[PDB]
């Protein structure tokens, strides 16, 4: 059982995102998830230090665990604490 979500890249206006299936049945830990997102979202420009934070789609809060993710929502991955407010969808 897993939640289908979509992960965007902070500040990237044209990157359509990557759908993920996420839960403890898919990843050993939140850190495991961030490390796979680092590999799959890596681009030497917008993610200069990989994925270290995950924001909700409006930047209202950071996601801190897999359980806080909700089926069918979208999320934004950042190298740092600075949420870029662009039209991801």
């Amino acid at each position: 059982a897993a939640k289908k979500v979509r992960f965007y890249r902070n500040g990237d206006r044209y990157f359509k995102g990557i759908v993920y299936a996420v839960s403890s049945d898919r990843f050993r830990s939140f850190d495991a998830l961030l490390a796979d997102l680092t590999r799959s979202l890596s681009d030497n420009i917008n993610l200069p230090q990989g994925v270290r934070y995950i924001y909700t789609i409006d930047g209202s809060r950071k996601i801190g665990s897999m359980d806080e993710l909700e089926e069918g929502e979208s999320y934004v991955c950042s190298s740092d604490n600075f949420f870029k407010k662009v039209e991801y969808t």
């Epitope: 500040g11 206006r13 990157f15 681009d43 030497n44 917008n46 200069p48 870029k84 407010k85 662009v86």
Partner: antibody, heavy 115, light 108 residues
Framework: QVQLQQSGADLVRPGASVKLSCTAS????????VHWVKQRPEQGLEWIGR????????KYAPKFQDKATLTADTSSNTAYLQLSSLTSEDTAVYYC????????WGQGTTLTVSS | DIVMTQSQKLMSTSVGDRVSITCKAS??????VAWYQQKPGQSPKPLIY???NRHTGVPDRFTGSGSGTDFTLTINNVQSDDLADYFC?????????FGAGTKLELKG
């Protein structure tokens, strides 16, 4: 719409410094990244560097790290390209550009370095 | 320092023709490539993003294709308004690098 508005043509003597500016309307530069590029008739387009106005983070091309300094004020929605110790090779048109995609360009600034 | 090679400095064409402009990257760059049109005295106009996507306002006759190292801007049904300079750009890594430019002239 989305607009990038660069400062006027400038003529400065060699060895001096000059400040080129790029003012955004239609979006907030806090939410984006501003790039700069140099164009000469024969060398083509050369990327200068990039700034993230949200934290100040800058990235420069190898040829420009000593010569160029990128700054930005989110308050004025304005990005700045400072060029120091100007030589004859800095005579060029400079553009600012919205993001690594360059999906919006400034109109350009013709800089003439000359005594 | 990746090199974007536009081996055609000058391409001659006729109104109505199809013209294909190449750009070869010196190492794999996925689809992080863009294309731009520039006319004398004007800033570049964005045409293509992520190798194959038309920017808004770009007419149907422009198509971008390729991935890896080999990229092509295709102009079908060439118009006089399309006689201009075209360059590619990679933003797969720093520094971002442009091709040297392909000039599209009229064949006389």
């Amino acid at each position: 719409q989305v607009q990038l508005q660069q400062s006027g043509a400038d003529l400065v003597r060699p060895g001096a410094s000059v400040k080129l500016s790029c003012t955004a309307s239609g979006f907030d530069i806090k939410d984006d990244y501003v790039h700069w590029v140099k164009q000469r008739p024969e060398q083509g387009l050369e990327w200068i560097g990039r700034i993230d106005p949200a934290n100040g983070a800058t990235k420069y091309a190898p040829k420009f790290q000593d010569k160029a300094t990128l700054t930005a004020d989110t308050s004025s929605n304005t990005a700045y390209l400072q060029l120091s110790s100007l030589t004859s090779e800095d005579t060029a048109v400079y553009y600012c550009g919205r993001s690594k995609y360059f999906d919006s360009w400034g109109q350009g600034t013709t800089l003439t370095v000359s005594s | 320092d990746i090199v974007m090679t536009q081996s055609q400095k000058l391409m001659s064409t006729s109104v109505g023709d199809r013209v294909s402009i190449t750009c070869k990257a010196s190492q794999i760059v996925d689809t992080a490539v863009a294309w731009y049109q520039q006319k004398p005295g004007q800033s570049p106009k964005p045409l293509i993003y992520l190798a194959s996507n038309r920017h808004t306002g770009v007419p149907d006759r422009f198509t971008g294709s390729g991935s890896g190292t080999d990229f092509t801007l295709t102009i079908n049904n060439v118009q006089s308004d399309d006689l201009a300079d075209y360059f590619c750009l990679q933003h797969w890594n720093y520094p971002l690098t442009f091709g040297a430019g392909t000039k599209l002239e009229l064949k006389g």
